[PDB]
Structure formats: C-alpha cells, structure tokens
C-alpha cells in the first residue's frame, strides 16, 4: 500500500501531539495509536471533532516491557497538558488494550472515589489483541522463541513489500537472534523502498516484536468500574462486547459501525463515530 510513513513513527518524535487546532477550555480527547505506533489513522476524526484532540504515538521514549509500563508513561505525558482528571481516552485496535489500562490506572489512583473518565474503544479490547497474538502463536512450534521472532518480523516486512510469506520466513528463520532478523528485514524493505530511513525502520521492526510480546502477556489486575463504549466494525468469533464484560463491572455500551477494521474511522463509519463522540461527551 501507499503512505508508508503512516507505518513509521519518528523515533525522536514527541509522545503527545496536537491533531487539531480547536482552542477552548473543554477537556481534550487523547487517542492511542494502533500497533504501528503512529496517529495517522486519527487525522480525519481529529479534523472533525469540536474538542481539542491529541494523539499518543510510540517513540524510543516508550517502555514496552509491559502494557502496564506503556500506560503509566502515556498518563505522565497527558498530565503535561491536563494535570487533573476527569480524562477522555480512546484507543484503536492494539491501542484499545493500551487505553483500557490507562483508565484502570487512573481509577486505582483515585480509589474508591468514582472517576467520570470516558473510555472509547475503536474495534478492539484487551481480548481482541490477545485473540490475534494467540492465533499467530498457535501455528508455530511451542517454546521456540526464534520462530515467534521470525513470525512477527515476517508480518512487519509484508506490510512494506509484496514478498510471499514463505520466502521471507526462509530468510529470517535460520538467523542467530532478533537484531539479525531486524537487520535482514530493513535490507529487504530498503530494496523495495530505497529512500526510507534505516533507523526509523530498525526501530519499527524491533518495537513491533516487543509490542506483540507486551500484548500477549497483558491481563488487567482487577475489573474496570468505569463505563466503557465499544465501536466495533459491522464487517469483522470473539463475542458482541469483544469480552469486555469479563474485564469491566460497569456499563459496557456496544455500537456497530459501518465498514471493517481498517475503514471504520473513515467515510460512513466516521460520520457515526463523530456523532456518537459529540453526543457522548455529555
Ligand atoms: C488487534 C489485532 N491487530 C491486527 C490489526 S494487532 O493488534 O495490531 C496484531 C496482533 C498480533 C499480530 C501478530 C503477528 S505474529 C504474532 C504472534 C507473536 C506474538 C508475540 C511475539 C511474536 C509473535 F510472532 N502476532 C499482528 C497484529
């Protein structure tokens, strides 16, 4: 596909970035990236929202040892613009899991006072990401980390080139460790796209593996007491609430939205989401 710079983050970029020019005292919406770590997917939404909108992007500054560490770091970044709650948080896809942990940590900090934080999940959940990682893992040799590394880096290379799965798998499988798999992957992508930045790609390939690892290993400590809204694609089985009932003990509202996983933040889907958010800020 095109705009490959949407699959890449500036590793020396800021974690928190304005995504619209709305200047007002109304509390901002913070939007958490999909797995590629960029805020690109949110530009249409942000340009249409009548409240100040920021994006959270995944730079060299982000800790990826756990979803818990990542979420704590994104809360600290948010407080550089909004020191005090309540907080409006959304996440898309991989970002849905991360935003959920941020709201849990904010709940814990204030316990037992009820927070009036708002959480929106764009087509994912703690479980939606787990389901994906468990699928890819369950077609591999168990206990064979080299095969997991190979699988992750192969998927990354396939988002930049049209190379067949098996020929990328063959090239990466016999290599000594992650850093060699990363170096081989950047050389393959550079061949297809000679002007892309080697350090951007290196950071993107390595972090892709670490992001997947953090997501597998994630389970909320306790359940989220706040009320959540899920905005899931009309065109996707994992369940109607993507298993949020298992991790929330508050009001879980599900809206089905025109489009698929990739298109629901655009076109007809985007109109519905904008109307839902704009009324839902109430
Ligand atoms: C929410 C679902 N998403 C799809 C858009 S997503 O969030 O970004 C998403 C989720 C998983 C995978 C994937 C590829 S290989 C894989 C298995 C795996 C785990 C850990 C380490 C190495 C691995 F090899 N897991 C890729 C993408």
Q: Please check whether residues 108 and 167 belong to one and the same domain.
A: no
Contact 70, 99 (CB under 8 A): no
Count of C-beta atoms within a 10 Å radius of residue 281? 14
Cα–Cα distance, 97 to 152 (Å, whole number): 19
- Same-domain pairing of 105 and 4: yes
Contact (Cβ atoms closer than 8 angstroms) between residue 100 and residue 126:
yes
What's the CA gap between 107 and 54, in Å, rounded?
21
Phi, psi of 76, deg, nearest 5: -60, -40
Same-domain pairing of 186 and 133: yes
Is residue 265 within 8 Å of residue 90, measured between CB atoms? no
Ligand 1 center–CA 180 separation, angstroms: 20
Q: Tell me if 204 sits within 8 A of 156, measured CB to CB.
A: yes
Q: Which atom of ligand 1 is nearest to the CA of 129?
A: 1
Q: Is 191 found in the same domain as 241?
A: no
Q: Which residues contact 84 (CB under 8 A, 6 or more apart)?
A: none
Residue 21 CB partners (closer than 8 Å, separation 6+): none
**Start-to-end Cα distance in the chain:** 39
User: How far is the centre of ligand 1, averaged over its atoms, from the C-alpha of 26 (Å)?
Assistant: 36
Domain check: are 85 and 197 in the same one? no
Q: What's the per-residue H, E or C state across the chain?
A: CCCHHHCCCCCCCCCEEECCCCCCCCCCEEEECCCCCCCHHHHHHHHHCCCCEEEECCCCCCCCCCHHHHHHHHHHHHCCCCCCCCCEEEEECHHHHHHHHHHHHHHHHHCCCCCCCEEEEECCCHHHHHHHHHHHHCCCCCCCHHHHHHHHHHHHHHCCCCCCHHHHHHHHCCCCCHHHHHHHHHHHHHHHCCCCCHHHHHHHHHHHHHHHHHHHCCCCCCCECCCEEEEEECCCCCCCCCCHHHCECCCEEEEEECCCCCCCCCHHHHHHHHHHHHHHCC
Which atom of ligand 1 has the smallest separation from the CA of 261? 5
Q: Alpha carbon 210 to chain centroid distance?
A: 13
**From atom 9 of ligand 1, which residue's Cα is the shortest distance away?**
132
Domain that holds residue 171: 128-217
Number of other residues whose CB lies within 10 A of the CB of residue 232: 23
Q: Do 183 and 226 fall into the same domain?
A: no
Structural method: X-ray
Q: Which residue precedes each gap in the chain (C to N above 2.5 Å)?
A: 236
Q: What is the resolution of this structure in A?
A: 2.0
Q: Are residues 93 and 226 in the same domain?
A: yes
Q: Are residues 145 and 80 in the same domain?
A: no
- Cβ of 73 less than 6 Å from ligand 1: no
Q: What atom in ligand 1 is closest to the CA of residue 150?
A: 24
With beta carbons less than 8 A apart as the criterion, state whether 226 and 250 touch: yes
Number of C-alpha atoms within 13 angstroms, CB side, residue 61? 17
Distance, in Å, from the CA atom of 200 to the CA atom of 205, rounded to the nearest integer, reads: 9
> What would the two tokens of residue 272 be?
């519905």
| Residue to mutate, 38, 141, 144, 151, ligand 1, most ligand atoms under 8 Å from C-beta | 151
Report CA torsion sign: 5, 10, 11, 17.
negative
Q: Is 137 in the pocket of ligand 1 (CB under 6 A)?
A: yes
Q: Using the 3D structure, point to which of 217, 240, 266 is the last residue of a domain.
A: 217
Report the atom number in ligand 1 closest to the C-alpha of 155: 14
CB 30 within 8 A of CB 88: yes
Is the distance from the beta carbon of residue 132 to the nearest atom of ligand 1 less than 6 Å?
A: yes
Considering the domain architecture, whether residues 96 and 234 belong to the same structural domain is answered as: yes
Strand partners, 54: 18, 30
Instruction: With beta carbons less than 8 A apart as the criterion, state whether 203 and 211 touch.
Output: no
Do 50 and 164 fall into the same domain?
A: no
Are the beta carbons of 53 and 42 closer than 8 angstroms? Answer: yes
What b/e sequence results for 65-83 when a residue is b if at least 16 CB atoms lie within 10 Å of its CB, and e otherwise? Answer: eebbebbebbbebbeeeee
Whether residues 207 and 232 fall in one domain:
no
Question: CA–CA separation, 70 vs 145, rounded Å?
Answer: 23
Q: What are phi and psi of 221, to 5 degrees?
A: -60, -60
Token pair belonging to 51: 């409240």
Q: How many domains does the chain have?
A: 2
Cα-to-centroid distance, 136 and ligand 1 (Å): 7
User: Do 78 and 39 sit in the same domain of this protein?
Assistant: yes
């Amino acid at each position: 596909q095109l705009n490959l710079r949407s699959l890449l983050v500036n590793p020396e970029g800021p974690t928190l970035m304005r995504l619209n020019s709305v200047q007002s005292s109304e509390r901002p919406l913070f939007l958490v990236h999909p797995i590629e770590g960029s805020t690109t997917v949110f530009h249409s939404l942000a340009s249409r929202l009548s409240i100040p909108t920021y994006g959270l992007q995944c730079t060299r500054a982000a800790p990826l040892d756990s979803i818990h560490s990542l979420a704590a770091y994104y809360i600290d970044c948010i407080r550089q613009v909004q020191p005090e709650g309540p907080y409006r948080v959304a996440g898309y896809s991989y970002g849905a899991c991360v935003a959920f942990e941020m709201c849990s940590q904010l709940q814990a900090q204030q316990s037992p006072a009820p927070t009036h934080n708002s959480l929106f999940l764009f087509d994912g959940s703690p479980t939606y990401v787990l389901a994906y990682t468990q699928s890819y893992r369950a077609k591999l040799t168990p206990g064979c980390e080299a095969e997991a590394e190979t699988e992750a880096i192969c998927f990354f290379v396939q988002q930049f080139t049209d190379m067949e799965h098996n020929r990328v798998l063959e090239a990466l499988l016999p290599l000594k460790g992650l850093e060699e798999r990363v170096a081989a992957a950047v050389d393959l992508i550079i061949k297809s796209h000679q002007g892309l930045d080697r350090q951007e790609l290196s950071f993107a390939a390595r972090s892709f593996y670490y992001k997947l690892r953090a997501a597998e290993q994630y389970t909320p400590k306790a359940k989220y007491h706040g009320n959540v809204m899920l905005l899931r694609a009309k065109t996707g089985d994992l369940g109607a609430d993507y298993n949020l009932s298992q991790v929330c003990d508050g009001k879980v509202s599900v809206h089905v939205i025109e489009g698929d996983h990739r298109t629901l933040l655009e076109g007809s889907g985007l109109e519905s989401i904008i109307s839902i958010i704009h009324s839902s800020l109430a």
